[PDB]
Design a protein around this ligand. Structure first.
Ligand SMILES: [Mg+2]
Ligand SMILES: [Mg+2]
Ligand code: NA
Ligand code: NA
Ligand code: NA
Length: 1206
RNA sequence: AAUUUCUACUAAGUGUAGAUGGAAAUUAGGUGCGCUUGGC
DNA sequence: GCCAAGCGCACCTAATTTCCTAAAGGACG
DNA sequence: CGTCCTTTA
């Protein structure tokens, strides 16, 4: 037979972009320089972005006029049905209609206005925007695009999107109804649960400062009020209710979420918080919070820094004022110096005793002396402690051990902090002195920011320690000889708060960086397309000479200069492209044949018009197959009379009777409405056109076109050549919409790292036995960015006319059903491994297993191993430390992309080698360490058109016949748990499971009560010591425990076998010995057969807490250390059918292993097996019902699968 | 350490291997730090 | 030491939309 | 009436 892969070619179409360098040839550059086309094009890009901004001012005005005047009708019905918890399938459809009607309501409000049509035509530039604007300069900018408004076509599409009624991400209607109305209704539910919590005063504060006293806070949680929140102005008010704002004085006014969090933290509860609404499309309103003016120049920051933080500055004297205050502590009453309860006490507690909570513990101990252990008790103790407003230093002294003195320690600390400020000055006298001027800009001067930040840091650290000694403020007996002075020095120390923020907010800006700009050559529709009839209008074509391809651009004054070039019958010739496209027959045939021009020459019958004007062919409620054939016949005869087409594409249509619908005919026109060929044109004469500057010529270039290129080309190079290859029968088409850019040089060449000619360069690969390379030319780092570069972007279309049309998912289920031995590739996001791969066959035998932390490659017999796990971790640390240091933050997305491109390649190779399907975790780690989402996207992308560059283009899986084994990637939003060959399955207990028996830990073993522990110990069939094995044995029937019904075997004998890694820091624990130590601590005769009743007689709560913890470690099969690839073992407390305990460390040691080599490998293995279970589920089902099989294995089903396979 | 671009390279000497859907628009997320009020 | 709710500033990242056109139509000299 | 920009399906 064939493979399953073989059936997945020519399934659906997609577009890609091929990118190239464009290299000016001959006098092209000089002529561009003389005519000044690049300064023209660079300025146009600046002005173009300016007109878009002005256009947006109008659109936002138009959006607000409409939205401010809209009352949504379907509103109460929608909200009522949206909540109702017993929605039948009828009611779900009903709710869907009201959601549509609400979006239609908004969209019609926009599209209703007069001249809504005019918003996306030249009228808005030439007329409407000039009237709306006032500034004579802004007007002149808009007016400079008269005769160039075609250049805004795409921007106008971007703007129309905003007014779509569709449930689409860029639509205002979508943002109002699908997102903000959904969040608003969710908040109404939250408001009814949470309402009891807010006191009258808190509610009135928001009403007064947030609402202006014009509404009640309850208003914004009633349905009828949603209209208020359709505009940004309203959203901002709503979100202030939720989140509060910062006043002009800096006071943080609290919103509802703050009050919910405080209530939760006060009462140990978990009330839900409100979701804020998203922004309205195209708005930009000021924050309702006040933030002070920030510095703006390298000069001003240096001024503020030297002014306010020099030794003569006041801030400095307050520090010494405060050090003298503490140094003479004994001249002040320690009964009158107060540390406010809260974070100040936490700080002083750590500073003096080593931990934040020591003072609370000493206070709790004294409370216990009077009142002493219920939860009632601890909660009363907490409430009594939280009532205390502050602690005196004298009181603090009574908590100190006999040897420690509290007031001496405070002196010692403040001494240590002022010293550290001096240490930092010792490196900063240079930045301060009058002579100093700076070399590089602060945003790029690392050495000067580190001086500033280290001094700023040392002052902040002193400030926060000082703040602890303020107290509550209103204590009665507080020493004012200390506090009058303290408050004076502290209040000027606070000056550093605005300085610190303002300096940080400036110095951490990335410096500006210019972007490339589009070139138009004075054509508002430049290079829009390649049809020969349009060459004059677009003024751009493609030429070929030998292996080399060229972009040819006709100067505006010489639009016809190329057409006039005949073939040279003797000398050399360029091959000029001859390109014909009939684009989109479903729009192009109506367009011309029902036009004023054509209906003149050739009148359709009144019947044809009526069939078309009413849509009797569209395959809808009014579909009429006889009418569809009559219309097709009119197009056909119109086509024979339209020479521009019938001559270009000698059409060959099926007889009309054979068409089932109008698309059946349109697909024939579309498949034949495309031809590419070459004519000859005199090289001498074409080159003279470039000489005289009537033609501009660029070589279409990447490194594979170099005469020194001799290896496998890039895939994209192959795509580009195949566009013009005779063996390409339409699988890859050249598309319109090409664009040309100028990217100005961004590096200076004399500042690039150079490896000089004739001097040996070190090779970096340690496996490369050739330690050195010596070249006869210079090699420059990032050379390409040290010159101006043209780049050409060329869209292409792949499988424009697909023929293998079927539901991809269904075909996969059908092929698997009838496959004797299907291979699954299990892929797991592990703890110690970015990705882990295990391949299984149809019977679940492991065929390959390895980590993808490192990528292996081999070329010319040379191995290269790239440790990407290490590279990414290095990069994450550089980014983390740069954020904390105010230094440059390096990119990581390219490194993840480069890593994942290697992963994807390896998986495509596994898919092709083993004809295999792919099993993934159905996600429904820490964000910067994450890699899996990018890996999904790039893998799905590749499987939309999967090519092996090594294959012949025309072979299955070659560049003309790519495999399409995932559905066309529209969005993550629209994905199910199957995307062709990729199955997403529940990850539940795929890693934390014994692969050799299926045993899983279903016990709750976190310590709770002494009687709970008794119950837990009593539920085991027996506990005993096994002397012949030196093991403790725990016989259990799962049916005697809560939360158990998922397990299938039920009866297990757990043994204290082996070691475990305890985490808390980490330490190795030997179970049997730890048990023995525990029982011996308490005089338990653990040899006394069944020790169960003996264990329950213990009364010390510390026995049971220690016992439950040992039980936990025993059921902890997964044992790993953070930062250790090599300590990730899986060990079972259960014996298999032959008396053996599964230890992954047995398998990690062997080259090929029957069972998982570690816990992350175990995850990939069982993810794969959950898909094997689903393949077995397709087999039980009949073909016509295959797309109804639930591929998600239930928990109980998995425990039975995993415990029975073995 | 060269690139349409990216990642790893030097790969036998102006490059090697793999990947690469671009443009525009909208919007969201995350990290870090400061401040406010709180919890452990 | 860690953390929550909220505000602010700086930075980097990424999801989801649209187009990937020749020819009719017309404003303009 | 030719050319160049805009609008259409
Ligand atoms: Mg190559
Ligand atoms: Mg590099
Ligand atoms: Na796309
Ligand atoms: Na944001
Ligand atoms: Na943040």
């Amino acid at each position: 037979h064939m493979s399953k892969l073989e059936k997945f070619t020519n399934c659906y179409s997609l577009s890609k972009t091929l990118r190239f360098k464009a290299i000016p040839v001959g006098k092209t550059q000089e002529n561009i320089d003389n005519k000044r086309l690049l300064v023209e094009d660079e300025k146009r890009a600046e002005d173009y972005k300016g007109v878009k901004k002005l256009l947006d001012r109008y659109y936002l005005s138009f959006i607000n006029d409409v939205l401010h005047s809209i009352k949504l009708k379907n509103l109460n019905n929608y909200i009522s049905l949206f909540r109702k918890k017993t929605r039948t399938e009828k009611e779900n459809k009903e709710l869907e209609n009201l959601e549509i009607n609400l979006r239609k309501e908004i969209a019609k409000a926009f599209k209703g206005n007069e001249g809504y049509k005019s918003l996306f035509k030249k009228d808005i530039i030439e007329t409407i925007l000039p009237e709306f604007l006032d500034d004579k300069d802004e007007i002149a900018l808009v007016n400079s695009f008269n005769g160039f408004t075609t250049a805004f076509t795409g921007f106008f599409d971007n703007r129309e999107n905003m007014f779509s009624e569709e449930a689409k991400s860029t639509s205002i209607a979508f943002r109002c109804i699908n997102e903000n109305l959904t969040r608003y209704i969710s908040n109404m539910d939250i408001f009814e649960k949470v309402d009891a919590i807010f006191d009258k005063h808190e509610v009135q504060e928001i009403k007064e400062k947030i609402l202006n006293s014009d509404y009640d806070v309850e208003d914004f949680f009633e349905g009828e009020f949603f209209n208020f929140v359709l505009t940004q102005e309203g959203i901002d008010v709503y979100n202030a209710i939720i989140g509060g704002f910062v006043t002009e004085s800096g006071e943080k006014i609290k919103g509802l979420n703050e009050y919910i969090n405080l209530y939760n933290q006060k009462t140990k509860q978990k009330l839900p918080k409100f979701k804020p609404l998203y922004k309205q499309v195209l708005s930009d309103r000021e924050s309702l919070s006040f933030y002070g003016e920030g510095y703006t120049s390298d000069e001003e920051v240096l001024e503020v820094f030297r002014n306010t933080l020099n030794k003569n500055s006041e801030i400095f004297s307050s520090i010494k004022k405060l050090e003298k205050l503490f140094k003479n502590f004994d001249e002040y009453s320690s009964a009158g110096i107060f540390v406010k309860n809260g974070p100040a006490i936490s700080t002083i507690s750590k500073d003096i005793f080593g931990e934040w909570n020591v003072i609370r513990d000493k206070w709790n101990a004294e409370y216990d002396d009077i009142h002493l252990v219920t939860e009632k008790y601890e909660d009363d103790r907490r409430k009594s402690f939280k009532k205390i407003g502050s602690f005196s230093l004298e009181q603090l002294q009574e908590y100190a051990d006999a040897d420690l003195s509290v007031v001496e320690k405070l002196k010692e600390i403040i001494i240590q902090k002022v010293d550290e400020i001096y240490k930092v000055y010792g490196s900063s006298e240079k930045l301060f002195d009058a002579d100093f001027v700076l070399e590089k800009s602060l945003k790029k001067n690392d050495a000067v920011v580190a001086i500033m930040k280290d001094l700023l840091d040392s002052v902040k650290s002193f400030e926060n320690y000082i703040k602890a000694f303020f107290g509550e403020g209103k204590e009665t007996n507080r020493d004012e000889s200390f506090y009058g002075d303290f408050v004076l020095a502290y209040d000027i120390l606070l000056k550093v708060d605005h300085i610190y923020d303002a300096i940080r907010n400036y110095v951490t800006q990335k410096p500006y960086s210019k972007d490339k700009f589009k070139l138009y050559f004075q054509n508002p529709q430049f290079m829009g397309g390649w049809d020969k009839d349009k060459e004059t209008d677009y003024r751009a074509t493609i030429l070929r000479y030998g292996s080399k391809y060229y972009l040819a651009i006709m100067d505006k004054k010489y639009a016809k200069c190329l057409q006039k070039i005949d073939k040279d019958d003797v000398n050399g010739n360029y091959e000029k492209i001859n390109y014909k496209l009939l684009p989109g027959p479903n729009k192009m045939l109506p367009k011309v044949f029902f036009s004023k021009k054509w209906m003149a020459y050739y009148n359709p019958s009144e019947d044809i018009q009526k069939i078309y004007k009413n849509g009797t062919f569209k395959k809808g409620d009014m579909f009429n197959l006889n009418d569809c054939h009559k219309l097709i016949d009119f197009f056909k005869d119109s086509i024979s009379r339209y020479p521009k087409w019938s001559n270009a594409y000698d059409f060959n249509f099926s007889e009309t009777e054979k068409y089932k619908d109008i698309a059946g005919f349109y697909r024939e026109v579309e498949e034949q409405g495309y031809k590419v060929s070459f004519e000859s044109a005199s090289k001498k004469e074409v080159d003279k056109l470039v000489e005289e500057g009537k033609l501009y010529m660029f070589q279409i270039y990447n490194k594979d076109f170099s005469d020194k290129s001799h290896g496998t080309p890039n895939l994209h190079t192959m795509y580009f050549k195949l566009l013009f290859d005779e063996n390409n029968h339409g699988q890859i088409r050249l598309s319109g919409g090409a664009e040309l850019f100028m990217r100005r040089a961004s590096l200076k060449k004399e500042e690039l790292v150079v490896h000089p000619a004739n001097s040996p360069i070190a090779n970096k690969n340690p496996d490369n036995p050739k330690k050195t390379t010596t070249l006869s030319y210079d090699v420059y780092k990032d050379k390409r960015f040290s010159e101006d570069q043209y780049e050409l972007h060329i869209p292409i279309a792949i499988n424009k006319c697909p023929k293998n049309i079927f539901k991809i998912n269904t075909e996969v289920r059908v092929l698997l059903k009838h496959d004797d031995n299907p291979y699954v590739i299990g892929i797991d996001r592990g703890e110690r491994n970015l990705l882990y791969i295990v391949v299984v066959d149809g019977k679940g035998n492991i065929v390959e297993q390895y980590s993808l932390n490192e990528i292996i490659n081999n070329f010319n017999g040379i191995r290269i191993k790239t440790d990407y796990h290490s590279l990414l971790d290095k990069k994450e640390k550089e980014r983390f430390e740069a954020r904390q240091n105010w230094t440059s933050i390096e990119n990581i997305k390219e490194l993840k992309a480069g890593y994942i491109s290697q992963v994807v390649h390896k998986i495509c190779e596994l898919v092709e080698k083993y004809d295999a399907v792919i099993a993934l975790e159905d996600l429904n780690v820490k964000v910067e360490k994450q890699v899996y989402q990018k890996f999904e996207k790039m893998l799905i992308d590749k499987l939309n058109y999967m090519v092996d560059k090594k294959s012949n283009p025309c072979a299955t899986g070659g560049a003309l016949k790519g495999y399409q084994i995932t559905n066309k990637f529209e969005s993550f939003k629209s994905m199910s748990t199957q995307n062709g060959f990729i199955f997403y399955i529940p990850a539940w207990l795929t890693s934390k499971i014994d692969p050799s028996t299926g045993f899983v830990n279903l016990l709750k073993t976190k310590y709770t009560s002494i009687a709970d522990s008794k119950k837990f110990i009593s539920s085991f069939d027996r506990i005993m010591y096994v002397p012949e094995e030196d093991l403790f044995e725990f016989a259990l029937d799962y049916k005697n425990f809560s939360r158990t019904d998922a397990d299938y075997i039920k009866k297990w004998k757990l043994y204290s076998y082996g070691n475990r890694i305890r985490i808390f820091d980490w330490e190795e624990v030997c179970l049997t010995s730890a048990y023995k130590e525990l029982f011996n601590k308490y005089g338990i005769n653990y040899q006394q057969g069944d020790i169960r009743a003996l264990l329950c007689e213990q009364s010390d709560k510390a026995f049971y807490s220690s016992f439950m913890a040992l039980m936990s470690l025993m059921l902890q099969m997964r044992n790993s250390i953070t930062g250790r690839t090599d300590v990730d073992f899986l060990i079972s407390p259960v014996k298999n059918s032959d008396g053996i305990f599964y230890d992954s460390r047995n398998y990690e040691a062997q080259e090929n292993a029957i069972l998982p080599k570690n816990a992350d490998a175990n995850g990939a293995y069982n993810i794969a097996r959950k898909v094997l279970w689903a393949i077995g589920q397709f087999k039980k089902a009949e073909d016509e019902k295959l797309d109804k099989v639930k591929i998600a294995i239930s928990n109980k089903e998995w425990l039975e699968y995993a415990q029975t396979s073995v």
